[PDB]
PDB file of C-alpha atoms in Angstrom:
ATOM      1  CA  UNK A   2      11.454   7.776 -10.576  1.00 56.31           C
ATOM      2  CA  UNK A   3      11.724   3.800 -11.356  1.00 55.80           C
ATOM      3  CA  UNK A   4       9.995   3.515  -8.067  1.00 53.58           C
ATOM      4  CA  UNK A   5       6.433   1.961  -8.106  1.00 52.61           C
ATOM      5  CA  UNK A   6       4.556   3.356  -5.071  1.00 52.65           C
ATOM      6  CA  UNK A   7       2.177   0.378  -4.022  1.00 53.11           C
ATOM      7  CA  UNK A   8      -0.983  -0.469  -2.372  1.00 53.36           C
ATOM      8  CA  UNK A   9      -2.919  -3.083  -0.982  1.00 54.54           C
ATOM      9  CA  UNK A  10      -5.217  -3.960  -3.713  1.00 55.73           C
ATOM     10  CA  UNK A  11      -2.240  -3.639  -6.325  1.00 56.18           C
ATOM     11  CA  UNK A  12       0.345  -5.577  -4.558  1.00 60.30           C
ATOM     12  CA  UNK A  13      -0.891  -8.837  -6.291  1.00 61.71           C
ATOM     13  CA  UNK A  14      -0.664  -7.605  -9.309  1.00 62.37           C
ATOM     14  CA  UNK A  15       2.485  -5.434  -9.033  1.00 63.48           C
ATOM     15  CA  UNK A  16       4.510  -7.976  -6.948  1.00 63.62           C
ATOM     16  CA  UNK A  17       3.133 -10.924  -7.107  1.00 61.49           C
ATOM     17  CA  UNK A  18       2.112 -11.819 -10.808  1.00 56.46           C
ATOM     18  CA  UNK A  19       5.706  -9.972 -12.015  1.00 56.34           C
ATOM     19  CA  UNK A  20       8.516 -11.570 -13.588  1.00 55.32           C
ATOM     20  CA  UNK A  21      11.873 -10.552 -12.659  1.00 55.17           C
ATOM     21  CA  UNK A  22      12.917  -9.477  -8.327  1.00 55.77           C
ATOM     22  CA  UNK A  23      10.768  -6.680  -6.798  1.00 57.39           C
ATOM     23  CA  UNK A  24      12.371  -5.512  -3.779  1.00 57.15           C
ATOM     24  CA  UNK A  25       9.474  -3.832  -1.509  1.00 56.58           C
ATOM     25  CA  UNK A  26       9.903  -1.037   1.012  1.00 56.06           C
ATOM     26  CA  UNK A  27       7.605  -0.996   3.932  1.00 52.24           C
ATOM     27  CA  UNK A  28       7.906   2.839   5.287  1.00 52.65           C
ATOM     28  CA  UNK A  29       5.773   6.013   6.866  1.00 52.29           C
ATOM     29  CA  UNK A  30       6.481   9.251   7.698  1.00 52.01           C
ATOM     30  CA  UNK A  31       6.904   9.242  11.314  1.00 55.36           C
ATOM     31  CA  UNK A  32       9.599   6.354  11.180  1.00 56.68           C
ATOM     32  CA  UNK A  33      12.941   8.528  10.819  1.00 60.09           C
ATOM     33  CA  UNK A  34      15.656   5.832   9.321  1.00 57.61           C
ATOM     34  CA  UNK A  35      12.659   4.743   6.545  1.00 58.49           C
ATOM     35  CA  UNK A  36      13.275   8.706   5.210  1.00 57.33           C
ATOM     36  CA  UNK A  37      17.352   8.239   5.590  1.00 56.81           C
ATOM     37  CA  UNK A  38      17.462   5.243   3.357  1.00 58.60           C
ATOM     38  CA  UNK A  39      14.773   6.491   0.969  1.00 59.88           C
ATOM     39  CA  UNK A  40      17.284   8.203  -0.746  1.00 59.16           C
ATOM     40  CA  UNK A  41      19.238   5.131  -1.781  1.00 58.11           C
ATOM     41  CA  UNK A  42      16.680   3.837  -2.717  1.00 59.60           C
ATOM     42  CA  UNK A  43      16.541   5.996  -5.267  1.00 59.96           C
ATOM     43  CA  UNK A  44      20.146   5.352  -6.459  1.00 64.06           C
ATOM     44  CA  UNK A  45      19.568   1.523  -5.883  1.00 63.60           C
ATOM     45  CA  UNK A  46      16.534   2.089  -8.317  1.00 62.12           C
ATOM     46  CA  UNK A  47      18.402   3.668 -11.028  1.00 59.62           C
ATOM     47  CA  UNK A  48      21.721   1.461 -11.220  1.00 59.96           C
ATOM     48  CA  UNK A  49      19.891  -1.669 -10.677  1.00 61.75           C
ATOM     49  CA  UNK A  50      16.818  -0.689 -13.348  1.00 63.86           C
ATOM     50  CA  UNK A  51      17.211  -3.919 -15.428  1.00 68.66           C
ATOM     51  CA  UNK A  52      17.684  -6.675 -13.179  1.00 67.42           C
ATOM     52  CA  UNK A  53      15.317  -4.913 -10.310  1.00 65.14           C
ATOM     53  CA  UNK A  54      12.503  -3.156  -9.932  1.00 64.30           C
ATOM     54  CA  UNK A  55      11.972  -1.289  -6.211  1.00 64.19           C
ATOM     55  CA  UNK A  56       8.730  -0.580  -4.781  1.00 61.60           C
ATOM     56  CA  UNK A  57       7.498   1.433  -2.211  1.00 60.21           C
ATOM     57  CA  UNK A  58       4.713   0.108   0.194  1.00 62.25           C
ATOM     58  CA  UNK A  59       3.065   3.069   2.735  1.00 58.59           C
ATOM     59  CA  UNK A  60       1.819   1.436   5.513  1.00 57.54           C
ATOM     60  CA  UNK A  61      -0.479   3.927   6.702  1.00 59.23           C
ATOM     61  CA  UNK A  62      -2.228   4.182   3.965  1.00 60.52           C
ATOM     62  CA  UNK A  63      -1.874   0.095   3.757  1.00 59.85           C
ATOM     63  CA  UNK A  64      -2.115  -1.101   6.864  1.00 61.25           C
ATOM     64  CA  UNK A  65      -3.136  -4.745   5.319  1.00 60.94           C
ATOM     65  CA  UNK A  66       0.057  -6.183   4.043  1.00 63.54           C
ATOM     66  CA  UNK A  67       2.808  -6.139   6.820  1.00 66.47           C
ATOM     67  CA  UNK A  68       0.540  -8.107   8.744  1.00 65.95           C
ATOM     68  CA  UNK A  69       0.453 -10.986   5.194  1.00 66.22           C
ATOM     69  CA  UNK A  70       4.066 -11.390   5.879  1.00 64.17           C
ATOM     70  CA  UNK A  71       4.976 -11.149   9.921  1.00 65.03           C
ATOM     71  CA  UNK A  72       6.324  -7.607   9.517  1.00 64.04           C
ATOM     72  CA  UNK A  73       6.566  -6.000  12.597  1.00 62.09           C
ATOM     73  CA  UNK A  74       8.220  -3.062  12.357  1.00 65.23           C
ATOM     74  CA  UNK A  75       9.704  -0.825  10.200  1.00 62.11           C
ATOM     75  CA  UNK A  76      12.297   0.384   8.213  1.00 65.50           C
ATOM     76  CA  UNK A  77      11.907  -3.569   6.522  1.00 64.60           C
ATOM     77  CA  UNK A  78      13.019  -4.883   2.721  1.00 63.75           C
ATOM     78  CA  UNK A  79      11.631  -7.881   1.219  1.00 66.31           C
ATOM     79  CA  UNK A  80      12.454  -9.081  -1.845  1.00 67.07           C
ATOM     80  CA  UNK A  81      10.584 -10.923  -4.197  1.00 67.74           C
ATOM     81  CA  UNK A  82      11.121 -13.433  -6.876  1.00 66.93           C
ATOM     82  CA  UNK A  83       8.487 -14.059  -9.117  1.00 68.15           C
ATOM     83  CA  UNK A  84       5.831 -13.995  -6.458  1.00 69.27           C
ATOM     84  CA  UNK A  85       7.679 -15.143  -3.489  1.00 66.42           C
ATOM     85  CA  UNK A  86       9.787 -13.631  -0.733  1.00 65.72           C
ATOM     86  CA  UNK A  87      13.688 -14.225  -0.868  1.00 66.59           C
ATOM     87  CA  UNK A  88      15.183 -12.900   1.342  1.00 63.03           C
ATOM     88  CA  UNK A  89      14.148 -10.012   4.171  1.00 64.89           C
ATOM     89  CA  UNK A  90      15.964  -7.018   5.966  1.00 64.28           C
ATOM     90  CA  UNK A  91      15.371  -5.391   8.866  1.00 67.12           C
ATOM     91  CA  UNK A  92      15.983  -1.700  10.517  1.00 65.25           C
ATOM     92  CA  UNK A  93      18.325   1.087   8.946  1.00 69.04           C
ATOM     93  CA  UNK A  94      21.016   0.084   6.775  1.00 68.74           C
ATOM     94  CA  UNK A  95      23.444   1.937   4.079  1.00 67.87           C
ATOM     95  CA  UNK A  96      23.974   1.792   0.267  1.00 68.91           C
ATOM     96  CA  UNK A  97      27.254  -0.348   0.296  1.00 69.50           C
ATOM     97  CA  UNK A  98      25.067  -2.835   2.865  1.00 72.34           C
ATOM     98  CA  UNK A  99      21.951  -2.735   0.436  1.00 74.07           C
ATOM     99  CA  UNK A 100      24.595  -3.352  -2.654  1.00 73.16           C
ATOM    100  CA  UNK A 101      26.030  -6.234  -0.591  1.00 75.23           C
ATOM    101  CA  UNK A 102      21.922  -7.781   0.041  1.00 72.58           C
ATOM    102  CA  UNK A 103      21.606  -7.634  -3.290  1.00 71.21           C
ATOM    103  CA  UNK A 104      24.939  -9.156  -4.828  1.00 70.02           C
ATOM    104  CA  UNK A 105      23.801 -12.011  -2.381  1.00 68.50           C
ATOM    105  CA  UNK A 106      20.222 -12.668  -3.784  1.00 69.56           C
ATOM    106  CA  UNK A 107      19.789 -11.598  -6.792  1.00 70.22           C
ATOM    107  CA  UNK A 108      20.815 -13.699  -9.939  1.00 70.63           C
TER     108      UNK A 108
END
């Protein structure tokens, strides 16, 4: 919905070079939890549209970036800052624990 599905060649331009957090999803289809907490990230998207945008990174079909920033498995969250990474989170997790992540890091 508010969700910008990335790639490797956009990344720069839609994380990087943006003003205002990005959180980015690394996910695939075969990884089970990445499909359980796609769904709040769909709520996260919509009450936090404003102060947060949340983007969606496929590594199969972009199997370049992980690798950029020591990601070595997945589910994983990184959120940026006006081209930077702020803070990082790792394996499944639930709305009230992504709520908490983000009352600690973002502004």
């Amino acid at each position: 919905d508010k969700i910008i599905h990335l790639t490797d060649d956009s990344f720069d331009t839609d994380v990087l070079k943006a003003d205002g957090a990005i959180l980015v999803d690394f996910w695939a289809e075969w990884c089970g939890p990445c499909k359980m907490i796609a769904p709040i990230l769909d709520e996260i998207a919509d009450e936090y549209q404003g102060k947060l945008t949340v983007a969606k990174l496929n590594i199969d079909q972009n199997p370049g970036t992980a690798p950029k920033y020591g990601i070595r498995g997945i589910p994983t969250l990184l959120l940026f800052k006006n081209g930077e990474v702020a803070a990082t989170k790792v394996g499944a997790l639930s709305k009230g624990q992504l709520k908490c992540f983000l009352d600690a890091n973002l502004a």
